[PDB]
């Protein structure tokens, strides 16, 4: 059928789009590239040929098969960071992935599903007894800290388990993040400066060697222990794996690491949006309450209750829709393949656009925010949040559970109040590797007032 896409320019067709994903920013150059030409088409990021695309045919197809288990990304920043074929987010190794992801996928779901949904309501319920830690002279709760904060304690006490400093991680995470976000693919011309990089490169290893404090502890914690299979756990899992011959020390460093800033990353951005979008929408808030005190009035939250909560699990999936976090997911393929009628050769990276494409296809009203497009039972073929299939999100269980526990046990003793003119379509976004909120501006603040 051939390809879509602007004009090769013999040095320059290449030259031209990568420059300006480089200025625009990942997010809005794809954003941008989709409505220029198709839903379909093709951009050069390095030399190679990178396709983006939103046809949910398209996205469908690449999920689901399994020669599309890979992501791509600058070799020289990935190593930057720790995940050249270290990882998983972003391990390529499709061997030594393969092998590792297991692990995860273990640990975030069955036994250790259930007992997220009551530490969750844990560590939120502990650092609201402790506003004091993150509200304003004149009354302003910095929620994304309050959030980061509770989200990393939550991954702690689930996965690993180890005593840590709760406020010094959460901007070390964050620096991470910026790095992470910024080297995936500055072209390899980059590197060679120095004075213009080793910026980000300390606050890497400024992690990386903070970590590396708590699973020394960890270590020996197992060695002098209470007979083993009495409590397993994300980190031991691993660090047995390695007492075998199944796992570098290396890798399961970065996977202890991987574990920890995944939750802080993404969940406390989401959540942020949620409670923005909560404050400017009155009724839909109501309807909230009603449902929580309907099923729960004033008891715990416990497993049994987050089939029951329809309604907001329907809230979740809108701001999900509406407001992305993540909205586009990087594949590579490594087999050929004829896709949507399309040649696609193998080492070909694809950018899914789904942030797009939830705009652009089977939603009744893809462009106002509304419980509406959650009415009709969603097919799960045209609404893609985290992915499915061989290599979607590991989380994407565990995740839509959190989500239901810390947004119910907020919500149950504070009414939120956005600051002034706000929502979340005012707010000033950085667009690059995720849609986050800018934090060069100030306005991102909240004001909890109480309930009963
Ligand atoms: C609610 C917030 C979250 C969103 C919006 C989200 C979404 C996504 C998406 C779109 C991907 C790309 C996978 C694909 O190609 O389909 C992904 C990957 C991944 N997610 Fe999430 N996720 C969330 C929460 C989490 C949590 C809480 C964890 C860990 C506790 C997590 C762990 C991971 C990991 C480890 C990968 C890489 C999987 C792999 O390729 O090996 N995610 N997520
Ligand atoms: C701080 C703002 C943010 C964020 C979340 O997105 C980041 C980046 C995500 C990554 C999964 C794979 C994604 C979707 C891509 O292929 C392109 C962007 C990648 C993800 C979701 C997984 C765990 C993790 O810890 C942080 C993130």
Redesign the pocket.
Same mark, same amino acid.
């Given at each position: 059928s051939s390809i879509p896409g602007p004009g090769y320019c013999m040095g320059i067709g290449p030259l031209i789009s990568h420059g300006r994903f480089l200025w625009m920013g990942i997010g809005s150059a794809c954003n941008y590239y989709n409505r220029v030409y198709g839903e379909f088409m093709r951009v050069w990021i390095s030399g190679e040929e990178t396709l983006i695309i939103s046809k949910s045919s398209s996205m469908f197809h690449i999920?689901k098969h399994n020669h599309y288990s890979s992501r791509f990304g600058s070799k020289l920043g990935l190593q930057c960071i720790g995940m050249h074929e270290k990882g998983?987010?972003f391990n390529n190794n499709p061997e030594l992935?393969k092998t590792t992801?297991p692990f995860?996928m273990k640990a975030?779901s069955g036994p250790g599903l259930v007992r997220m949904v009551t530490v969750c309501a844990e560590s939120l319920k502990t650092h609201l007894d402790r506003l004091e830690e993150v509200t304003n002279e004149s009354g302003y709760v910095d929620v994304l800290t309050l959030l980061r904060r509770v989200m990393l304690d939550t991954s702690n006490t689930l996965f690993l388990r180890i005593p840590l400093d709760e406020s010094a991680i959460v901007v070390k995470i964050q620096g991470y993040f910026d790095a992470w976000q910024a080297l995936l693919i500055k072209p390899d011309i980059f590197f060679k400066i120095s004075w213009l990089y080793k910026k980000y490169e300390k606050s890497v290893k400024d992690l990386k060697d903070a970590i590396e404090v708590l699973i020394a502890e960890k270590r020996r914690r197992i060695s002098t222990e209470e007979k083993l299979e009495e409590c397993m756990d994300f980190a031991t899992e691993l660090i047995l794996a390695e007492k075998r011959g199944d796992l570098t020390r290396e890798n399961v460093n970065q996977c202890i690491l991987?574990?920890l800033i995944? $939750?802080p990353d993404? /969940?406390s951005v989401?959540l942020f949006f949620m409670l923005f979008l909560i404050a400017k929408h009155p009724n839909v808030e109501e309807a909230i309450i009603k449902e929580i005190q309907t099923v729960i009035g004033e008891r715990d939250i416990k497993i049994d209750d987050i089939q029951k909560l329809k309604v907001m699990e329907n809230f979740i999936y809108e701001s999900?829709r509406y407001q992305p976090?993540?909205d586009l997911?990087m594949?590579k393929a490594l087999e050929d393949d004829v896709i949507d009628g399309y040649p696609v050769k193998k080492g070909t990276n694809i950018i899914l656009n789904i942030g797009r494409m939830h705009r652009l296809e089977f939603f009744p009203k893809p462009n106002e925010f509304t419980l509406e497009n959650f009415a009709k039972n969603v097919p799960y073929r045209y609404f893609q949040?985290?992915?499915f299939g061989p290599?979607?999100?590991?989380?994407?269980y565990? $995740?839509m559970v959190? /989500?239901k526990a810390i947004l119910v046990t907020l919500l149950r003793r504070f009414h939120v109040k956005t600051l002034q003119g706000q929502c979340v379509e005012s707010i000033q976004k950085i667009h690059d590797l995720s849609l986050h909120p800018d934090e060069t501006k100030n306005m991102l603040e909240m004001i909890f007032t109480p309930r009963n």
């Open positions: 999920m998983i987010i992935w992801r995860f975030l991987e574990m995944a $939750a993404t /969940m989401s999900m976090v993540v997911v594949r949040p985290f992915g290599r979607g999100c590991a989380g994407k565990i $995740a959190m /989500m």
